[PDB]
């Protein structure tokens, strides 16, 4: 469910439009955390900060 | 040439996935009544998986209880087996707790009493579930106060009285009992360990045992190394903690049984013993708990 996957990343992102590498590191095992960091592009939309990752772009590429 | 399901039932949307089965809504066309069809493609199953499929079918037929999914029908066709269940429409209990926002010990106690009644019924019928976990705790409907329904007997086994045996390595790591992890002979008490894990999660929203290194996770379970850290556990009644301790008891012979747990005052005297305070942090953690499970499930599918 593509509406539940981005929504789940957003939950782990504490409702932010992007997720940080250390948040993936904290909330997921070291495997799928460094998996995601090296397949998540870069969030440049509203509210972006250094390190912000685009979990929505990582997602909709799949579902 | 036996095609009774194809003849008399119409399939609709998927309701849940499984490793080697799918669950789709269906309608008994003549009656117009909705059911859930758990469908297994049997065309190239191994003999062992045939046995396990047949086992699940027997156990499901055998279990009739208000808090267990109810088998309506069972149909064998050439390359498909159909288990037809009464449809439950309330979704996962953990998702409903989050959606309804407010949750107290009194709510958790009412939830776990229902789970314990399901489990007690399984054990009275000589059945050990072995897969008690959040994905298998459904709600009968979207009605407020709808009943909990225990689902998924795919891992369930038949036992004879109180005899213990090595029935194999099966279950989700975070819910596994010390005796299974030690490869000891086991039986019904493995279900009550898993109930203690679930109940711990119902109270604070995160699991009692958690480590990305699964070898260390299993060490921690086998040591019964869980804690009630401050601040969240400071507001949990002693009686709720006491019930968890008795479920999360390493020695299975001393672990509390389902019948004893149903007489535990936090359960049997919930109205005067269980706290009615809303636990906002519990719901917040549960929201992350559910997201971590769905993502960890969606991710390995993609890998
Ligand atoms: N009786 C039912 N009514 C509605 N949905 C169901 C029912 N039984 C199962 N499902 C849905 O299908 C999913 C998988 O059910 P389960 O029997 O656990 O299949 P598997 O064991 O193959 O995973 C469940 O999580 C649930 O969402
Ligand atoms: Mg199953």
Coordinates of C-alpha atoms and ligand atoms in Angstrom, one line a residue:
Chain A
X1 CA 0.0 0.0 0.0
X2 CA 1.8 3.1 -1.3
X3 CA -0.3 5.4 1.0
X4 CA 0.8 3.4 4.1
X5 CA 4.5 3.2 3.2
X6 CA 5.2 6.9 2.9
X7 CA 2.9 7.4 5.9
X8 CA 5.0 5.0 7.9
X9 CA 8.3 6.7 6.9
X10 CA 6.6 10.0 7.9
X11 CA 5.7 8.5 11.3
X12 CA 9.3 7.5 11.9
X13 CA 10.3 11.0 10.6
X14 CA 8.1 12.5 13.4
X15 CA 5.8 13.9 10.8
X16 CA 8.5 15.7 8.8
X17 CA 8.3 15.7 5.0
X18 CA 11.8 14.2 5.0
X19 CA 13.7 11.7 7.1
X20 CA 17.3 11.9 8.5
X21 CA 19.9 9.2 8.2
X22 CA 20.2 9.0 12.0
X23 CA 16.5 8.5 12.3
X24 CA 16.6 5.5 10.0
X25 CA 19.7 4.4 12.0
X26 CA 17.8 4.7 15.2
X27 CA 14.4 3.2 14.1
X28 CA 15.5 0.4 11.8
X29 CA 18.3 -2.3 12.1
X30 CA 21.7 -1.2 10.7
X31 CA 20.8 -3.2 7.5
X32 CA 17.7 -1.5 6.1
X33 CA 18.9 1.8 7.6
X34 CA 22.1 2.0 5.5
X35 CA 20.1 0.4 2.7
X36 CA 17.7 3.3 2.7
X37 CA 20.5 6.0 3.1
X38 CA 22.1 4.7 0.0
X39 CA 19.0 4.6 -2.2
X40 CA 17.2 7.7 -0.8
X41 CA 18.1 10.7 -3.0
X42 CA 17.9 14.1 -1.4
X43 CA 15.0 16.2 -0.1
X44 CA 15.0 19.7 -1.6
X45 CA 11.3 20.5 -1.2
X46 CA 9.9 22.7 1.5
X47 CA 11.7 22.8 4.8
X48 CA 14.7 20.9 3.6
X49 CA 17.9 20.9 5.7
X50 CA 21.4 19.5 5.3
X51 CA 21.1 15.7 5.4
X52 CA 17.3 15.6 4.6
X53 CA 16.4 12.5 2.6
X54 CA 13.5 12.0 0.3
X55 CA 11.7 8.9 1.6
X56 CA 8.8 9.7 -0.7
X57 CA 11.0 9.5 -3.8
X58 CA 12.6 6.3 -2.4
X59 CA 9.0 4.9 -2.0
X60 CA 7.0 5.8 -5.1
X61 CA 9.9 4.5 -7.2
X62 CA 8.7 1.1 -5.9
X63 CA 5.0 1.2 -5.0
Chain B
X1 CA -13.7 -32.1 -11.0
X2 CA -14.6 -30.7 -7.5
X3 CA -15.2 -27.0 -8.0
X4 CA -17.7 -26.0 -5.3
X5 CA -15.9 -22.8 -4.3
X6 CA -15.6 -21.7 -8.0
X7 CA -19.2 -22.7 -8.4
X8 CA -20.8 -21.0 -5.4
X9 CA -18.4 -18.2 -4.2
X10 CA -17.3 -15.0 -5.8
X11 CA -14.0 -13.5 -4.9
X12 CA -13.3 -9.8 -4.4
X13 CA -10.4 -7.7 -3.1
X14 CA -7.4 -9.0 -1.1
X15 CA -7.7 -8.4 2.6
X16 CA -4.3 -9.6 3.8
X17 CA -1.2 -11.3 2.4
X18 CA 0.6 -14.4 3.6
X19 CA 3.9 -16.2 2.9
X20 CA 2.2 -18.9 0.8
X21 CA -1.5 -17.9 0.9
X22 CA -3.7 -14.9 0.3
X23 CA -6.9 -13.8 2.0
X24 CA -9.6 -12.4 -0.2
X25 CA -13.1 -11.2 0.6
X26 CA -15.7 -13.5 -1.0
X27 CA -19.5 -13.8 -1.2
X28 CA -21.5 -17.0 -1.0
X29 CA -23.4 -16.0 -4.1
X30 CA -26.7 -17.8 -3.4
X31 CA -27.0 -16.4 0.1
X32 CA -25.3 -13.0 -0.6
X33 CA -23.3 -13.4 2.6
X34 CA -19.7 -12.1 2.9
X35 CA -16.8 -14.3 4.2
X36 CA -13.0 -14.3 4.2
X37 CA -11.4 -16.9 1.9
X38 CA -7.9 -17.9 2.8
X39 CA -6.6 -19.5 -0.4
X40 CA -3.5 -21.7 -0.8
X41 CA -2.2 -22.7 -4.3
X42 CA -1.5 -26.4 -3.8
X43 CA -0.3 -27.2 -7.3
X44 CA 3.5 -27.4 -6.4
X45 CA 3.5 -27.7 -2.6
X46 CA 5.8 -30.1 -0.9
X47 CA 4.5 -33.0 1.0
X48 CA 5.5 -31.3 4.3
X49 CA 3.6 -28.1 3.3
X50 CA 0.6 -30.3 2.3
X51 CA 0.7 -31.7 5.8
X52 CA 1.0 -28.3 7.4
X53 CA -1.9 -27.0 5.3
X54 CA -4.1 -29.9 6.3
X55 CA -3.1 -29.4 10.0
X56 CA -4.2 -25.8 9.9
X57 CA -7.5 -26.9 8.3
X58 CA -8.2 -29.4 11.1
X59 CA -7.3 -27.0 13.9
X60 CA -9.4 -24.2 12.4
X61 CA -12.4 -26.5 12.1
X62 CA -11.8 -27.6 15.8
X63 CA -11.8 -24.1 17.3
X64 CA -15.1 -22.4 18.1
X65 CA -14.9 -19.4 20.5
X66 CA -16.1 -15.8 20.6
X67 CA -12.5 -14.6 20.4
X68 CA -11.2 -16.9 17.6
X69 CA -11.7 -16.5 13.9
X70 CA -14.6 -18.8 13.0
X71 CA -14.3 -21.3 10.1
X72 CA -17.4 -21.3 8.0
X73 CA -16.5 -23.7 5.2
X74 CA -13.6 -25.6 3.8
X75 CA -13.3 -26.5 0.1
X76 CA -10.6 -28.5 -1.7
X77 CA -10.2 -28.1 -5.5
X78 CA -7.6 -29.3 -8.0
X79 CA -4.9 -26.8 -7.3
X80 CA -6.4 -24.6 -4.6
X81 CA -7.5 -25.1 -1.0
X82 CA -10.0 -22.6 0.5
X83 CA -10.5 -22.0 4.2
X84 CA -13.7 -19.8 4.5
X85 CA -13.9 -17.7 7.7
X86 CA -16.5 -15.5 9.1
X87 CA -15.4 -12.0 7.9
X88 CA -13.9 -9.8 10.6
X89 CA -13.8 -6.1 9.6
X90 CA -12.2 -4.3 12.5
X91 CA -8.6 -4.7 11.3
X92 CA -5.6 -5.1 13.5
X93 CA -6.1 -4.4 17.2
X94 CA -2.9 -2.4 17.3
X95 CA -4.0 -0.1 14.5
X96 CA -7.3 0.4 16.2
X97 CA -5.7 1.4 19.5
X98 CA -3.8 4.1 17.6
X99 CA -6.8 5.2 15.5
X100 CA -9.0 5.7 18.6
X101 CA -6.3 7.7 20.3
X102 CA -7.0 7.0 24.0
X103 CA -5.8 4.0 25.9
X104 CA -5.5 3.0 29.5
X105 CA -4.6 0.0 31.6
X106 CA -8.3 -0.7 31.9
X107 CA -8.5 -0.9 28.1
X108 CA -5.4 -3.1 27.9
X109 CA -6.8 -5.4 30.6
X110 CA -10.1 -5.8 28.7
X111 CA -8.1 -6.6 25.6
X112 CA -5.7 -9.1 27.1
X113 CA -8.5 -10.8 29.0
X114 CA -10.1 -11.6 25.6
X115 CA -6.8 -12.8 24.2
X116 CA -6.4 -15.0 27.3
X117 CA -9.9 -16.4 26.8
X118 CA -9.0 -17.4 23.2
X119 CA -5.7 -18.9 24.3
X120 CA -7.3 -20.8 27.2
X121 CA -9.8 -22.3 24.7
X122 CA -6.9 -23.4 22.4
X123 CA -5.1 -25.1 25.2
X124 CA -8.4 -26.8 26.5
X125 CA -8.7 -28.2 23.0
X126 CA -5.0 -29.4 22.9
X127 CA -3.9 -26.6 20.6
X128 CA -0.8 -24.4 21.0
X129 CA -1.0 -21.3 18.8
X130 CA 2.8 -20.6 18.8
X131 CA 2.3 -17.4 16.8
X132 CA 0.7 -14.9 19.2
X133 CA 1.7 -11.5 17.9
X134 CA 0.1 -8.2 16.9
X135 CA -0.6 -9.2 13.3
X136 CA -2.8 -12.1 14.5
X137 CA -5.0 -10.0 16.9
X138 CA -7.9 -8.7 14.9
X139 CA -11.1 -6.9 15.8
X140 CA -14.5 -8.3 14.9
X141 CA -15.8 -5.1 13.3
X142 CA -15.3 -1.3 13.4
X143 CA -17.9 -1.1 16.2
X144 CA -16.5 0.6 19.3
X145 CA -15.8 -2.1 21.8
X146 CA -15.8 -4.9 19.2
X147 CA -14.3 -8.2 20.3
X148 CA -10.7 -9.3 19.8
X149 CA -10.4 -12.2 17.3
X150 CA -7.4 -14.5 17.4
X151 CA -6.3 -15.4 13.8
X152 CA -3.7 -17.3 11.8
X153 CA -3.3 -20.9 13.0
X154 CA -0.6 -21.5 10.3
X155 CA 2.0 -22.3 13.0
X156 CA -0.4 -24.0 15.5
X157 CA 0.3 -27.5 16.8
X158 CA -1.6 -30.2 18.5
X159 CA -0.5 -31.4 22.0
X160 CA -1.7 -34.2 24.1
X161 CA -2.7 -33.1 27.6
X162 CA 0.2 -31.4 29.3
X163 CA 3.0 -33.4 27.7
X164 CA 6.0 -31.3 26.4
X165 CA 8.0 -32.1 23.3
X166 CA 10.4 -30.4 20.9
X167 CA 7.8 -29.2 18.4
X168 CA 10.4 -27.3 16.4
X169 CA 11.7 -23.8 15.8
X170 CA 8.7 -21.6 14.8
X171 CA 7.5 -18.1 15.6
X172 CA 8.6 -14.4 15.4
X173 CA 11.9 -13.8 17.2
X174 CA 10.6 -11.0 19.5
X175 CA 7.9 -13.2 20.8
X176 CA 9.9 -16.5 21.2
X177 CA 10.0 -18.1 24.6
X178 CA 13.3 -19.0 26.4
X179 CA 12.5 -22.7 26.3
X180 CA 12.1 -22.6 22.5
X181 CA 15.4 -20.6 22.2
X182 CA 17.1 -23.2 24.4
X183 CA 15.7 -26.0 22.2
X184 CA 14.0 -27.4 25.3
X185 CA 10.8 -29.5 25.0
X186 CA 7.9 -27.1 25.2
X187 CA 4.2 -26.8 25.1
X188 CA 1.3 -24.5 26.1
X189 CA 3.4 -22.1 28.2
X190 CA 5.1 -20.7 25.1
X191 CA 1.7 -18.9 24.4
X192 CA 1.7 -17.2 27.7
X193 CA 5.2 -15.9 27.2
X194 CA 4.0 -14.3 24.0
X195 CA 1.0 -12.9 25.9
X196 CA 3.4 -11.2 28.3
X197 CA 5.2 -9.6 25.4
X198 CA 2.0 -8.4 23.9
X199 CA 0.7 -7.1 27.2
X200 CA 4.0 -5.3 27.9
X201 CA 3.5 -3.6 24.5
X202 CA -0.1 -2.8 25.3
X203 CA 1.1 -0.9 28.3
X204 CA 4.0 1.2 27.0
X205 CA 3.9 0.8 23.2
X206 CA 7.4 -0.7 22.7
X207 CA 8.6 -4.3 23.0
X208 CA 10.3 -5.7 26.1
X209 CA 13.0 -7.4 24.1
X210 CA 14.6 -5.5 21.2
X211 CA 18.0 -5.7 19.5
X212 CA 19.1 -5.6 15.9
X213 CA 21.6 -8.4 16.6
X214 CA 19.3 -11.4 16.8
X215 CA 21.9 -13.4 18.6
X216 CA 21.9 -10.8 21.4
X217 CA 18.1 -10.6 21.3
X218 CA 17.9 -14.3 22.0
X219 CA 20.4 -14.0 24.8
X220 CA 18.3 -11.2 26.4
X221 CA 15.0 -13.3 26.1
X222 CA 16.7 -16.4 27.5
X223 CA 18.0 -14.2 30.4
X224 CA 14.5 -12.7 30.9
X225 CA 16.3 -9.3 30.7
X226 CA 13.5 -6.8 30.4
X227 CA 12.9 -3.7 32.5
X228 CA 10.2 -1.3 33.6
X229 CA 12.2 2.0 33.1
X230 CA 11.1 5.4 34.3
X231 CA 9.3 7.5 33.6
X232 CA 6.7 5.5 31.6
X233 CA 6.4 2.6 34.0
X234 CA 6.2 4.8 37.1
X235 CA 2.5 5.3 36.5
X236 CA 1.7 1.6 35.8
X237 CA 0.0 -0.1 38.7
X238 CA 2.0 -2.7 40.6
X239 CA -0.6 -5.3 39.6
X240 CA -0.1 -4.8 35.9
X241 CA 3.6 -5.2 36.4
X242 CA 3.1 -8.3 38.5
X243 CA 1.0 -10.0 35.8
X244 CA 3.7 -9.2 33.2
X245 CA 6.3 -10.7 35.6
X246 CA 4.3 -13.9 35.9
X247 CA 3.9 -14.2 32.1
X248 CA 7.6 -13.3 31.4
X249 CA 8.8 -16.0 33.8
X250 CA 11.8 -17.9 32.3
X251 CA 10.9 -21.3 33.9
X252 CA 7.9 -22.5 31.9
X253 CA 6.7 -24.7 34.8
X254 CA 6.4 -21.6 37.0
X255 CA 5.0 -19.3 34.3
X256 CA 1.4 -18.3 34.9
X257 CA -1.2 -20.2 32.9
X258 CA -4.0 -18.8 30.9
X259 CA -6.6 -19.9 33.5
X260 CA -4.5 -18.5 36.4
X261 CA -4.0 -15.2 34.5
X262 CA -7.7 -14.9 34.0
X263 CA -8.0 -15.0 37.8
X264 CA -5.3 -12.4 38.2
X265 CA -6.8 -9.3 39.9
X266 CA -5.6 -6.9 37.3
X267 CA -7.8 -9.0 34.9
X268 CA -10.6 -10.3 37.2
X269 CA -11.0 -7.1 39.2
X270 CA -10.1 -4.7 36.3
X271 CA -12.7 -2.2 37.4
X272 CA -11.0 -1.4 40.8
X273 CA -7.4 -2.5 40.1
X274 CA -6.6 -1.4 36.5
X275 CA -5.7 2.3 36.1
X276 CA -8.2 4.4 34.0
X277 CA -5.5 7.0 33.2
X278 CA -4.9 7.6 29.5
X279 CA -1.3 6.8 28.5
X280 CA -0.5 9.3 25.7
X281 CA 3.0 8.1 25.4
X282 CA 1.9 4.5 25.0
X283 CA -0.2 5.4 21.9
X284 CA 2.6 7.5 20.5
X285 CA 5.0 4.6 20.8
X286 CA 2.5 2.2 19.4
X287 CA 2.1 4.5 16.3
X288 CA 5.9 4.1 15.8
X289 CA 5.7 0.4 16.6
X290 CA 3.1 -0.2 13.9
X291 CA 5.1 1.9 11.4
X292 CA 8.3 0.0 12.1
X293 CA 6.5 -3.3 11.5
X294 CA 4.9 -2.2 8.2
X295 CA 8.1 -0.7 6.9
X296 CA 10.2 -3.6 7.9
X297 CA 7.6 -5.7 6.1
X298 CA 7.5 -3.5 3.0
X299 CA 11.3 -3.2 2.8
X300 CA 12.5 -6.8 2.7
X301 CA 9.8 -7.4 0.0
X302 CA 11.6 -4.8 -2.1
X303 CA 15.1 -6.2 -1.3
Ligands
LIG1 N1 -11.6 -13.9 9.0 C1 -11.0 -12.8 8.4 N2 -11.7 -11.7 8.0 C2 -11.1 -10.6 7.5 N3 -9.8 -10.6 7.2 C3 -9.0 -11.7 7.5 C4 -9.6 -12.9 8.1 N4 -8.6 -13.8 8.3 C5 -7.4 -13.2 7.8 N5 -7.7 -11.9 7.3 C6 -6.7 -11.0 6.7 O1 -5.7 -11.7 6.1 C7 -4.4 -11.5 6.8 C8 -3.6 -12.8 6.8 O2 -4.4 -13.8 7.5 P1 -3.6 -15.1 8.0 O3 -4.7 -16.2 8.2 O4 -2.6 -14.7 9.0 O5 -2.8 -15.5 6.6 P2 -1.3 -16.0 6.6 O6 -1.2 -17.0 7.7 O7 -1.1 -16.6 5.3 O8 -0.5 -14.7 6.8 C9 -4.8 -11.1 8.2 O9 -3.8 -10.3 8.8 C10 -6.1 -10.4 8.0 O10 -5.8 -9.0 7.7
LIG2 MG1 0.2 -18.1 8.3

